[PDB]
Symmetry: C2
Subunit: 315 residues, 2 copies
């Protein structure tokens, strides 16, 4: 009766509520036995969870949508990381500029979930979990990544060469495709609704600890995961801080845009039903966000200040 949970990636600073809920016993007080596993190959995650060989884990929304549309019955039962900035990252002097014209002829990395999606002006490379590595090494010219993960990694390289952190640029998409969701195998959820419900309580307890005291929370996480005891993970942690979902709720507007955007581009069927639910959350849902797009422009500026000032601040 162990429950398996497959992370979306190798351990990250934003994986912190999951591990913390384990090391502080929160799963235990719920009568839950979590076996948290890590993937060697992030592309395995949806097929694994979908087929049922793994009960639960983490996955981005773009990929969670595609899974259902690929025959892998999975469902989102909570939100871990809400709308982190996604895009084509590059170094100043690449030579890519603020214009997309400069991306022509260049070589661009991505994780490799997709495959074939002006087909031969760019050159796609499949880098898996090493997109930012390969940019730094020049193997690729640019690559897809996240503002609080892959961009921070570019800036850590720049800092070692004495270069300002702003030399790490992003061609920004524009949402969001890259929200990290807690997911379940549909079958497991149907037969274990109480367990999933108890799982999310422990998650919520540890998220609260994380958001109330990011520092004390981190010290314990890195005592348990020394591979993250470094300056790069601590900066990434600082930039994830604002992206963490405090309520864990699926945001209906976000789901509605992406799915509707998908239907308008003929990618998803026009009767596709979005594969989330907020029903296993055991506490009240927060009000909708009033100015949804202007809070997007505020976030960029806020993340801009985090990069320079080195702190923990929610938007």
């Amino acid at each position: 009766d162990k429950i398996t949970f497959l992370l979306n990636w190798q351990p990250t600073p934003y994986h912190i509520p999951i591990f913390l809920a384990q090391t502080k016993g929160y799963f235990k007080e719920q009568g839950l036995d979590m076996a948290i596993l890590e993937p060697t190959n992030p592309s395995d995650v949806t097929e694994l969870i979908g087929s049922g060989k793994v009960d639960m884990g983490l996955k981005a929304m773009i990929h969670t949508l595609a899974a259902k549309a690929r025959g892998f019955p999975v469902t989102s039962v909570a939100s871990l990381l809400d709308e982190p900035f996604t895009g084509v990252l590059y170094l100043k002097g690449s030579g890519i500029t603020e214009d997309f014209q400069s991306l022509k002829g260049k070589k661009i990395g991505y994780v490799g979930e997709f495959g074939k999606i002006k087909p031969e002006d760019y050159t796609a490379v499949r880098c898996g979990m090493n997109v930012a590595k390969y940019i730094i090494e020049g193997k690729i010219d640019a690559g897809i990544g996240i503002e609080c993960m892959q961009q921070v990694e570019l800036e850590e390289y720049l800092a070692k060469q004495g270069r300002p952190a702003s030399d790490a640029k992003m061609l920004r998409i524009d949402c969001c495709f890259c929200t990290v969701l807690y997911i379940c195998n549909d079958e497991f959820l149907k037969k274990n609704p109480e367990k999933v419900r108890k799982f999310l309580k422990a998650i919520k307890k540890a998220t609260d600890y994380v958001l109330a005291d990011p520092v004390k929370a981190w010290s314990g996480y890195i005592d348990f995961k020394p591979q993250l005891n470094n300056d790069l993970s601590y900066k990434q942690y600082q930039r994830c801080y604002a992206y963490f979902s405090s309520s864990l709720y699926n945001v209906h507007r976000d789901w509605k845009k992406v799915t509707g955007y998908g239907k308008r581009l003929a990618i998803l069927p026009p009767d596709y039903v979005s594969n989330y639910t907020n029903e296993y959350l055991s506490w009240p849902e927060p009000e909708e966000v009033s100015d949804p797009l202007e809070a997007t422009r505020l976030m960029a500026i806020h993340q801009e200040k985090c990069r320079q000032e080195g702190t923990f601040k929610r938007l």
Copy 2:
């Protein structure tokens, strides 16, 4: 679906290199195989996850493999990866850390907590936990010989085996038979060209591109099994010890078999 799950015994080490290289060089692909390598957060989960069939295969030390069968976890060793690695005063002194299968559980962090003095000593491996201590000593000025180990050489485990869920083996003996090949090919490459092996490995697993890992690799080299064969002597001994110590039943059978290797035994 038809993915086969292989759950490592630990976070990625330098000794896991054949498994990873067999993937990155297309050896599993050329055998018609789809491997999904998983890595545990908690080593203690491994036996039970393979034991219950939730995961198909993986790695486990011998001692723990034997205990698994004796815990109602139907697992069987189909090959060997690392044969017999070497496992306040220099006498008895009663603190002490153990992985999880005075008494303090440290999981995969034992050596770390020794360095940090949260524990006095710990149970670990000459090529892994020990080389770690010796790295610490080198940074603060001491000789590598300042990291000392007891328990090495006595009358009385930590050989690491490729292992299968019994039901998975029964219903997929050819798949297992093709996996061990890929391993073999990769392994031969590692043994033949340990440096060039190592480079592609760290290109793929950056978390090992460091002086500690490369020193472990060097110590790990000697314990690699070239044949992948189960060594009957070792299994007989260890199951012998258990019986004569009344831990295992006197009609307990070693849960290994070399029948899925497809090349001559040394």
